[PDB]
Design a protein around this ligand. Sequence first.
Ligand SMILES: *[B]([O])([O])[C]([C]C1=[C]C(C([O])=O)=[C][C]=[C]1)[N]C(=O)[C]([N])C1=[C][C]=[C][C]=[C]1
Length: 263
Amino acid sequence: HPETLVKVKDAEDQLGARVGYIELDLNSGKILESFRPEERFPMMSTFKVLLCGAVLSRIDAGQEQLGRRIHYSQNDLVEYSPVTEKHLTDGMTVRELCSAAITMSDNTAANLLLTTIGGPKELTAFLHNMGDHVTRLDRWEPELNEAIPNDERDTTMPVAMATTLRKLLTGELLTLASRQQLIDWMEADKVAGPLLRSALPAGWFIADKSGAGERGSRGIIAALGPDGKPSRIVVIYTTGSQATMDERNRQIAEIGASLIKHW
Ligand SMILES: *[B]([O])([O])[C]([C]C1=[C]C(C([O])=O)=[C][C]=[C]1)[N]C(=O)[C]([N])C1=[C][C]=[C][C]=[C]1
């Protein structure tokens, strides 16, 4: 809708930085609205959805199990790991790790899950396979959030991320069971409160994954819709702003409010 774009361009002004936006009809896959759809942005923690998609794909092929318990040590822990830091003794199941990575944005959980599939380059390989030759992961947490301008490492394009997230949720890449498992994890997101969710009205469905990183990097990917069902895919990225977290959260929220208003 034209008015949402008005707010996207106004978010750019407010943040003094590029904003990438795209809106996909879930059913048809048709682009409803876009802005900088084919420019690169750092993925940040939003890649953790693609990662767990990669893990579920392996489970589908009988190469991994949700119940497999993984043990790790102090030395594996990095910053922001509010779940994996509690289970040094008991370890965690693959399922628990993917939960923590997606619902809590747990960095170590993500690293642990990257180790299971053979690292950043295997996730990028997994991506090339399903037909996304743009989204790339090159580093581990937390180095991937660096967000150096013009640096293409650890970046995606809104239109690629959106299209890729649509394939993972509604495509054949994953079994019905894994598709549902992935969506439920995104639906139980615990840390994205001040983004799209803060504009989301009661009764609406949302499954999302947020991201934060450096140099004002902030993002979110979501499947959402009215009446308790997702009906569109939304991707919002920004990088380069010197604004505070709160200011950046608000601009995203406000894009979300406009998105909802002109649904
Ligand atoms: B991620 O964005 O790759 C990671 C962890 C993180 C995620 C989120 C979110 O909304 O998903 C919010 C905050 C942190 N980012 C970092 O580890 C990054 N170094 C960082 C950490 C704290 C604050 C800003 C950036």
